[PDB]
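Entry for ECL complex. Fields follow.
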Amino acid sequence: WEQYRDRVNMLQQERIRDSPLLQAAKENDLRLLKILLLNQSCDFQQRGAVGETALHVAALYDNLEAATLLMEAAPELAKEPALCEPFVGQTALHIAVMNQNLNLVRALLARGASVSARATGAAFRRSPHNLIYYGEHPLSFAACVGSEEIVRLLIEHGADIRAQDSLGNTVLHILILQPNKTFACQMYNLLLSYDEHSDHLQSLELVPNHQGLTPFKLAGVEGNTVMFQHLMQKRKHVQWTCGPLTSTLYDLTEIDSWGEELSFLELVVSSKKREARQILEQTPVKELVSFKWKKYGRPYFCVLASLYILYMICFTTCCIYRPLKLRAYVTHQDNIRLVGELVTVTGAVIILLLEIPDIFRVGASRYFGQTILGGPFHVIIITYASLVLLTMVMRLTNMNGEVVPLSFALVLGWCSVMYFARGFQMLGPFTIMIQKMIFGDLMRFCWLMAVVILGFASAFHITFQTEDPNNLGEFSDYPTALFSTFELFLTIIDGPANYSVDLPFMYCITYAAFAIIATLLMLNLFIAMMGDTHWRVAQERDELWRAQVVATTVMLERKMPRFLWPRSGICGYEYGLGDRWFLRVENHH
Amino acid sequence: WEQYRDRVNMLQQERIRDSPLLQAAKENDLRLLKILLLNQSCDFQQRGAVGETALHVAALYDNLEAATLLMEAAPELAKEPALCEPFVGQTALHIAVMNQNLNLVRALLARGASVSARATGAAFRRSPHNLIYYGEHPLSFAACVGSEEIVRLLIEHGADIRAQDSLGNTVLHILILQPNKTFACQMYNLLLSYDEHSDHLQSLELVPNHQGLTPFKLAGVEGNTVMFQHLMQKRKHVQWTCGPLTSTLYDLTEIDSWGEELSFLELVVSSKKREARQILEQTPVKELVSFKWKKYGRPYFCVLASLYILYMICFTTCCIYRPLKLRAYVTHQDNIRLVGELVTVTGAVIILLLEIPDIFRVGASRYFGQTILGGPFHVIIITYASLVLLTMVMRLTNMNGEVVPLSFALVLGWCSVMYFARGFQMLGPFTIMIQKMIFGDLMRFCWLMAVVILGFASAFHITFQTEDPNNLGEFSDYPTALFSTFELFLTIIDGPANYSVDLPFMYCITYAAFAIIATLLMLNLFIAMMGDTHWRVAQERDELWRAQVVATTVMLERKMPRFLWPRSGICGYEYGLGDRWFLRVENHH
Ligand SMILES: Clc1ccc(CO[C@@H](Cn2ccnc2)c2ccc(Cl)cc2Cl)cc1
Ligand SMILES: Clc1ccc(CO[C@@H](Cn2ccnc2)c2ccc(Cl)cc2Cl)cc1
């Protein structure tokens, strides 16, 4: 409802026009402005629908002569907030900081000011239908514009740093949502120099938000990479540099696991934003995960695939015997016939026993089953789990059949094995493009192919009913006619033909008209097919391939036993360095 | 095991931290550094796990004030090598040459030095898990950094040139592995000016390595082409230049054959490195091999192809008669029936008689059967040789049949003729792309097409077994069902259909679901097919085409008789120039 906000904006700009006693500061009046304030007691009594006063329009643009003489009439006129609903609690300076007019700040500070007044306006929250998000306190509004010395001023009158908004946002992590670099790189250093000077206890960069998240990792998953670059020079310590060779060490007390089950490895694959895929760019991450996948990833990722592919060939093989009397069992083959599914019942309970907790860890299917990188393949994993139970609902009431839902389930079940097809030296990006464009361009012609075939079917059905179903027998009745022309569009079976004394009149030219559409429309599927790989997604299938490896190793580390996983790097102990657990990669120029 | 090297590196950097009596040179201490050396006899006794002493950290970066006063305490402290296993035998200056600090070399040379101490460190050999390879002697370490005058210094104290390492590497050919050009172009001249001054006898550029190879050809097959450019100006001699026309002569006493069976023509097609294909770039090679292929190559490359294509049509034709009694031979047709394979037995012994010596010339199949440019086609040449022998194992025990291995062999045998399909005016790069991408992208869908068809087959088999095999008869049993759906995916034969009183329920919608996968997945093979030729290998199929010609002429020259091959160029004799055998190409500006 942006037009609901647009209801109240133009009310003020001619309400100041209506009453002729207050708007003269907006249009730089001097001589008549010095007349109206002394003859009447009408200085403070002018309030708009917002709660508007004479200083906010004087700081709309800088009215230097307007804010000069009104302190003689009312010096307390600045310290009143606004009262309307979209601008609840917002005062005089709150517009006079984003103007970056340093000649304006000498007046209203020494003549009565209060920096602790926060700005709780309704147009100030983070929202998709609101453009800017600049924070709560005017220190944050000074930090957003990127001015170096006016932010010098308000600190020198007892400014607080640790104050947040109603949704827990401090002064620091509002920089990483804003895309500019050239002012956020320099302002970060001298503002972090003005700490408590007892910095490790009640740390200002370790205090969580209202969600409870350490504000450095917001920059990690929203991926403004220059902060991820710039904080790594505070942790750097050189060891030896010899010519074009140098050494470096890697501190990863935050890049770890068991951090109260809120590590960023859980959450870098959780974002739905497109820039966030390339956070694997710099050396603290990429050579770490490349060692973690080479040392423990590949020699364990294949053995469960082996024990799965021999699981399902056994369940496939044992189900080629189950119809036995459809056209009470004690024989010799009945023992292996029994254990063939007595294995798969305790093998089929585990596929829900391991796949319900990651469902209620997320909380909803709307944040589980949409990710391309996490994998939409779970929709067949969940329906493989129910068939076995259903297979058992038949043997309490003894209904006939119940191998036809098995027929409809076993193919999809067998198709499930290709989710571990990504872990090889190859074959990864081949299965990514198909899942990328089933949703993309297979959807198009499936809404146009069903709508074109049934008119063909009705035109074919209305003609051959004047003759017998014995001479041709292909187009008999309504259900098989649409099926016959639907599969006849795909040039699978040859068109029907007979040569006798009976011959239909209309069928030939409409068959040619069907062929003149089947010779180009099925091939116009191929051009919408082809237009994606050439320029559209040619770069997409490799970065997703190098992101599924960190996805599957973070998903696999949090389920397997501790015995199979130590943490990488070096020990650090026997050396008086503390519990910091460094790491080396070697760089060359 | 790079982490095994990483076990011992950080031990030193805080062991110097632990003992407070030796590390003060590393952190530029002056006043307290002058105290600890006189009160104790503790100057030489500090040794680390490497064998570390006080001068190596003083030459880590340049500690000018540290290496000033320790010669008053121990001037012999520089001439001790290291003792640990990864740094066996490496002394003080060995780090003080790669710093290129010319103010440092005035101290430790005149106060006791020895340039003959080689550096036998374990991190100094050529290895894939080690980054740099800079040589053995500090002359080579001076040559690698590319400094012009500090290499002036150590020559002036009796430096040797002809010394090598344990694997035979002199000072010269360590330049061609390093990719830089702008310092290797100028340093090569004045260092070659400092020869023995009796240069042709015991020549420094003709001394072989430990493998026994003349070090100029390392630059040929590793292909740093600027050395191949720069040495050709020492052999140049102008004759006449008239306007935009000039003449030049070509000395090829090294570009020849019979050079103790170790010519570079054998070995330019042997490398597995990608830059090495474009060594056909400059005029001593390209116009030479273009004359060798035009004069003798094409009028001889076709006649053996003719005598091969009439060989195998005769062997094909004679084998359409051999089953004679499967549903002792003296007739009139038995004479030509006998000689039809009496020709091919002595024609089939030669295909192994000529193709075992190039096997044990290489030594293993791992360096024979992998080359794309040499040709992986030998795998059918080796299996054509065994069928004939097998055909003869039947006629000692008289077993029934043995025309079915002939059936399985004759097609592949007939497919062998296209290895000489490269020698024409055309048709070369057409057969290169297919062999390039059988290994490339035919491998992908062959691991996904077999895994998808058998679930379809089991779903088709589980339904039709409730009915008779008489009404349809297509899906009868397990072995033919997978075969039937495997060839039915390829839209070769039409799908089965019948119209009677019996009609299956589940088959129609799963047939439509098979068709909705067969209409896009077989075409998603074509996009992985298409993505290679457009930008991926469009440049590859012509340079390989102009490299197979030098491959086949060097392979053909070393097998055919001398009568059919003289060497190209001009004679040189009747003229007092010596046995040098020049060549002319003409150049235009
Ligand atoms: Cl009735 C019927 C059921 C399933 C399929 C084909 O399987 C679908 C599964 N699927 C998708 C949406 N609803 C089920 C599939 C999905 C993803 C990939 Cl990568 C590959 C495949 Cl084969 C065809 C007909
Ligand atoms: Cl059982 C069977 C045997 C052979 C073929 C086809 O021949 C293969 C030979 N080949 C390759 C790997 N093992 C044998 C071939 C290889 C290279 C090229 Cl350029 C062209 C071809 Cl046709 C098909 C089935």
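NOTE: The longest helix of chain A spans residues 378-397.
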